[PDB]
Structure 1
Amino acid sequence: SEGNSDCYFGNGSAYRGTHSLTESGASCLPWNSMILIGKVYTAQNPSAQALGLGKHNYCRNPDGDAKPWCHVLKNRRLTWEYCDVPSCST
C-alpha cells in the first residue's frame, strides 16, 4: 500500500517478488542463463514452471525457502542466498 516497499508474506510463495539479488552474496544468475543448462533452478529448465522462474534474473523460492532467493557467483564457486526482499512484517 502507499509507498508499498517491495515485500513478501511468510515466504512469498504464490506472490511474485520484484527483487533480483541476494542480501550480500552477489547478483542472481540469469535463470535462462546458459551456465544453468539443465541445472538446479532456471528458466531453461524443463521444470521452469515449477521452478517459478522466467526469462529474467529475479529471485524466487523454487524450494519453498523463506524469502525468494537467487543464485550467486563466489570465488570460482557457485552459490545462492536469500534475496534482499524487505519483509512486510506487519
Structure 2
Amino acid sequence: QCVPDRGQQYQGRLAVTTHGLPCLAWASAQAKALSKHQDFNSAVQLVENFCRNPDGDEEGVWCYVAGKPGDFGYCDLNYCEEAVEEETGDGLDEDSDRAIEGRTATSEYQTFFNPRTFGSGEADCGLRPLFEKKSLEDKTERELLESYID
C-alpha cells in the first residue's frame, strides 16, 4: 500500500516524473555519465528506466530526465508516515573510505586523496603561513574557539 524506507526497497514499474517527464534509461549513456562520480547503494537495482532511490535521497525515488546536471525528477510514490528526524549532529552515511579500511598507523586525522596529481596541498592545508605557521592569532578567531567551550 505505502512504500517505506524512502522507497529504497521499491521494485515497481513507475517510469515518469511528477512533472510528467519520461525517465531516461539507467543504462543509457547520458544517464551513466551522470552516475559516473556518484555514490550508489548496491541493494538498489537500477532496472530499465524505473524510479529508484540509489543514493538514499531523503525525498525518495527519482530518475534522470535528460543529460545535463540537474536534469532529474522525483516520482510520485505514496510513502509512509515514518516519524523520525535528523538534527545538527545526527545524520551519518559512509563518507571518505572505500571498504572499511582501519589501517592508518603513522597519522591521526586520516587525510584522504592520494599523492600524484590529486595535486599537492594536503599535509599542510588549513594552516595559514601568516598565522598558524608564524604562531600568530588573527583578530577574531578567539570568538570561534570560545563558541565551542561555552
Interval of TM-score (by shorter of Structure 1 and Structure 2) = 0.5 to 0.7
Shift of 1:18: 3.0
Distance 1:10 1:34, change over 3 A: same
Aligned length: 78
Pick the aligned partner of 1:53 from 39, 43, 46: 46
Partner of 1:84: 76
Q: Could you list the runs of 5+ residues in structure 2 that have no partner in the other structure?
A: 82-150
* Backbone CA RMSD of aligned residues: 3.3
Partner of 1:73: 66
Structure number with the higher helix fraction is 2
Q: Aligned pair 1:26/2:21, yes or no?
A: yes
In 1, Cα distance between equivalents of 2:29 and 2:60: 25
Distance 1:38 1:50, change over 3 A: farther
Structure number with the higher strand fraction is 1
Other structure's SS at 2:46 match: coil
In 2, Cα distance between equivalents of 1:83 and 1:39: 18
In 1, Cα distance between equivalents of 2:8 and 2:44: 11
In 2, Cα distance between equivalents of 1:48 and 1:31: 14
In 1, Cα distance between equivalents of 2:27 and 2:77: 21
Contact 1:26/1:73 (CA < 8 Å) preserved in 2?
no
Shift of 1:49: 4.2
Q: Aligned pair 1:35/2:27, yes or no?
A: no
Partner of 2:54: 62
Q: TM (normalized to structure 2)?
A: 0.40
Counterpart residue identity of residue 67, structure 1: G
In 2, Cα distance between equivalents of 1:10 and 1:49: 15
Shift of 1:82: 0.9
In 2, Cα distance between equivalents of 1:77 and 1:39: 7
